[PDB]
Specification:
The structure is a homodimer. The first copy, chain A, is an alpha/beta fold. In chain A, the strands form two sheets. In chain A, strands 2-3-1-5-6 form a five-stranded parallel beta sheet, with helices on both faces. Chain A has a two-stranded antiparallel sheet with strand order 4-7. The relative contact order of chain A is 0.22. The interface between A and B is medium-sized, with 22 and 22 residues. The structure holds adenosine-5'-diphosphate (2 copies), 3'-fluoro-3'-deoxythymidine monophosphate (2 copies) and magnesium ion (3 copies). The site of one 3'-fluoro-3'-deoxythymidine monophosphate has 10 residues of chain B, from helix 5. It is classed as transferase. Keywords: thymidylate kinase, p-loop, transferase.
Chain lengths: 210, 210
């Protein structure tokens, strides 16, 4: 009956969202929690394959259409998310609706309001971690990628959108200094996550942006 | 330079949306207009096939996800719609965003506001025809179908949603008595359409619900 927590990891490019989400699930399970990992986009579904082809530049998709497919890709996982949480399983998610708004919101003539609407009503995270890293430190972690959106100019506009989203006080945002070592960042994230898991059993799962 | 008009046909089940859209395009072209037919859902695209499988009950899709796919299926045709209109081609469309809101809006716990958002900003129709028919007269036109949403209880909830949408004065709604003969309904629609085509060359294409 004691529900699991919904924990989201957001963050700048190469700050370590995927490395930290994997390590968090491993550590929680080793400490006796029931925890599982999710990511968005979830490329395994029918909509997920359309999204993967788009990000790889194997296909072009009209900007509004692709924004709605990224949102639909979250909604198709909502029945699973609510089932797992109600069963006491904590979910750790590598990117969520915040990345959806920030990446479309970085394109010309896309307001933050329009971008948020499709995701209104999704399961509300109990904890949103944002992994911060200065661009000099990110550069040492590798060269850009060949997927769509992998260029500094675009990443910088998405970052401004993320800062606008962080003003929303309906959400439990926590900043994480992702400039430290893999292990030191993990310990900071893990302690914040243990606290969130404990309190989530106290209030019902909320709805995002409503 | 004289743009074409965007004309939408909406209406109750079996009122004749598809019969009248076909006959309208044929008559406009015979009278010297450049006119072409479109329909939604457009089942030929990747998203269109997902939608067709859902309507045929060959697959189940989560309600929010399917609502966003119906909207994305309109946005993927926006570059074509704007190109055609700018080239002076009038477009006659069998269903549009109004059916999108009314059909999802008929399901439990779906507000009209949430349903409208994804379609905010689409090309705004210059003329929205709504084909009205009493349920007794519809029954004589055949038996229900085996596709999703083909049942009187659901169609009745969608009808209430359409009436809420008709209160919006930003749109040029025209009621059509679809109880007459195929030819008499066509003449009423055709005369309204000739008037709309003439004035559309006067004002820029608008944006829906904004
Ligand atoms: N704290 C860290 N210090 C040094 N390298 C890191 C750190 N976190 C991640 N990395 C490395 O940087 C790269 C990007 O990490 P990744 O977790 O894939 O980031 P994201 O998912 O945020 O793009 C990987 O090679 C990873 O091993
Ligand atoms: N005015 C009308 N009078 C009689 N039958 C009609 C009329 N309009 C359409 N029909 C018939 O009713 C059926 C439904 O028409 P259709 O155009 O497919 O409706 P919709 O697309 O609105 O469901 C078809 O068999 C069609 O021939
Ligand atoms: C969830 C989500 C991710 N992205 C983008 C962000 C990024 F460029 C890309 C691949 O994500 P990973 O970096 O996590 O591989 O997908 C979007 O553009 N919208 C979304 O809704
Ligand atoms: C455009 C549109 C149509 N429909 C529904 C309405 C109907 F039951 C179905 C098939 O449409 P046709 O009746 O025009 O075949 O699809 C929706 O549910 N949402 C939409 O956005
Ligand atoms: Mg990653
Ligand atoms: Mg039809
Ligand atoms: Mg609003």
């Amino acid at each position: 009956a004691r529900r699991g927590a919904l924990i989201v990891l957001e963050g700048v490019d190469r700050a370590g969202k995927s490395t930290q989400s994997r390590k968090l699930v491993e550590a929680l399970c080793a400490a006796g929690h029931r925890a599982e990992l999710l990511r968005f986009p979830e490329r395994s579904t029918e909509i997920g394959k359309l999204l993967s082809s788009y990000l790889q530049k194997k296909s072009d998709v009209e900007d509004h259409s692709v924004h709605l497919l990224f949102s639909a890709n979250r909604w198709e996982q909502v029945p699973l998310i609510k089932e797992k949480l109600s069963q006491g399983v904590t979910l750790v998610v590598d990117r969520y609706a915040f990345s959806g708004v920030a990446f479309t919101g970085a394109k010309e003539n896309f307001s933050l309001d329009w971008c948020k609407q499709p995701d209104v009503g999704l399961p509300k995270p109990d904890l949103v971690l944002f992994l911060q890293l200065q661009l000099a430190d990110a550069a040492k972690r590798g060269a850009f990628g060949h997927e769509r959106y992998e260029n500094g100019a675009f990443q910088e506009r998405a970052l401004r959108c993320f800062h606008q989203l962080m003003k929303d006080t309906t959400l439990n945002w926590k900043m994480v200094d992702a400039s430290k070592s893999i292990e030191a960042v993990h310990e900071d994230i893990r302690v914040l996550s243990e606290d969130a898991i404990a309190t989530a059993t106290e209030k019902p799962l909320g709805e995002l942006w409503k």
